[PDB]
Amino acid sequence: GTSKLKYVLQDARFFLIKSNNHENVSLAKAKGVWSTLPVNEKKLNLAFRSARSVILIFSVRESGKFQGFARLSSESHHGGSPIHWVLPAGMSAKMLGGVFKIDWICRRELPFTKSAHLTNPWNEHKPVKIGRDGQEIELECGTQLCLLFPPDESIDLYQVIHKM
Numbered sequence: 001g002t003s004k005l006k007y008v009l010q011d012a013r014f015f016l017i018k019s020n021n022h023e024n025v026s027l028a029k030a031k032g033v034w035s036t037l038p039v040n041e042k043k044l045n046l047a048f049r050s051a052r053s054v055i056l057i058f059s060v061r062e063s064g065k066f067q068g069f070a071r072l073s074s075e076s077h078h079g080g081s082p083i084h085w086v087l088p089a090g091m092s093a094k095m096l097g098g099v100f101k102i103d104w105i106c107r108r109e110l111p112f113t114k115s116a117h118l119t120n121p122w123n124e125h126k127p128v129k130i131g132r133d134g135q136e137i138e139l140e141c142g143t144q145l146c147l148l149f150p151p152d153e154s155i156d157l158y159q160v161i162h163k164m
């Protein structure tokens with residue numbers, strides 16, 4: 001069913017996360033973590049304190065799809081187990097902010113062709129697939145986008161609900 005999913009998404013905030021490569025999304029799906037550059041780190045920490053649920057919707061650049069979505073379970077923190085992210089050639093792990101813990105809500109893909117009817121008022125009413133990494137997605141658009149994903153029957157949202 002979709003009822004527990006709708007409960008988790010009620011009054012949530014939503015952010016578009018754009019990844020350079022599938023390997024980092026796979027790492028995030030396996031380890032339940034994400035890390036971003038400091039400008040987006042500050043935005044996500046502010047959002048985590050502001051709303052009952054903060055949802056990250058992931059898309060790998062050039063894939064034509066979203067790869068799933070997850071809920072922040074923590075603000076960012078430093079000093080944990082290091083994460084072997086794939087970095088751009090000139091970059092170092094020291095440029096990153098902290099690590100956010102995340103709980104996956106759906107690890108299934110959604111092609112952009114299925115979201116063409118959804119536009120984001122916070123990005124000039126452009127199709128929701130369009131946006132820089134960290135772009136906030138307005139509540140109604142974000143809720144409908146998450147509801148378009150195929151159900152992920154491997155995930156039990158009972159555990160997600162207890163952290164709220």
Ligand SMILES: C[C@H]1CO[C@H](c2ccccc2Cl)CN1
Binds near residue numbers: 024036095
């Ligand atoms: C999952 C993380 C992995 O590191 C990326 C990065 C690190 C340092 C400089 C530039 C970038 Cl894009 C961002 N996404």
